[PDB]
Amino acid sequence: VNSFSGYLKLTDNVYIKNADIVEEAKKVKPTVVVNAANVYLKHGGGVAGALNKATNNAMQVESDDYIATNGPLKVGGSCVLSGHNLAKHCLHVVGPNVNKGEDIQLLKSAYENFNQHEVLLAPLLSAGIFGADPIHSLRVCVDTVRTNVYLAVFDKNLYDKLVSSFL
């Protein structure tokens, strides 16, 4: 039993809700919140910009130190950093950005990072400003993640479309 509330159950381990991941994180304080990161951990917009703003820029400060030490992430890769006031940990995961020409096959590799964590609150990877089809992202998620994932979808119209078209 965990503290997530109001989710539709898609599969044994994947749950979905129309919710702002920022507000959801602030309420649940999950062990792991997933960020829709880029390789530079520059949290300018989208989910990343929103999560960082909610930390009063502390996520960005921590991230800049991480990059200065380790260099950029790989597309499809991840790193674990602090969750600040939102969660215990933030798993920064880099899905391919279609608006940069990156290979969509790397979306499966990106979701594989979730399997290192028993329970996660997460957005759909590569959706939104990353330019991929969110329906496809949901399919890859369901077919790749085996741990318990609670997906927050900000846009209500998109949420209804994902549910109604889910196989």
Ligand X SMILES: O=C1CC[C@@H](c2cccs2)N1Nc1ncnc2[nH]c(Cl)cc12
Task: Tell me, letter by letter, the H, E, C secondary structure of 117-160.
Answer: CCEEEECCCCCHHHCCCHHHHHHHHHHHCCCEEEEEECCHHHHH
Where does this chain bind ligand X (CB under 6 A)?
20-22, 46-47, 50, 123-124, 127-130, 134, 152-155, 158
Q: Write out the H or E segment, with its range, that includes residue 70.
A: helix 58-70
Compare residues 97 and 109 and give the one whose CB is closer to ligand X. Answer: 97
Question: What sign does the CA torsion over 20, 129, 52, 66 have?
Answer: positive
| Cβ nearer to ligand X, comparing 69 with 164 | 164
58 or 65: whose CB is closer to ligand X?
58
Q: Which residue is nearest to ligand X (CB)?
A: 128
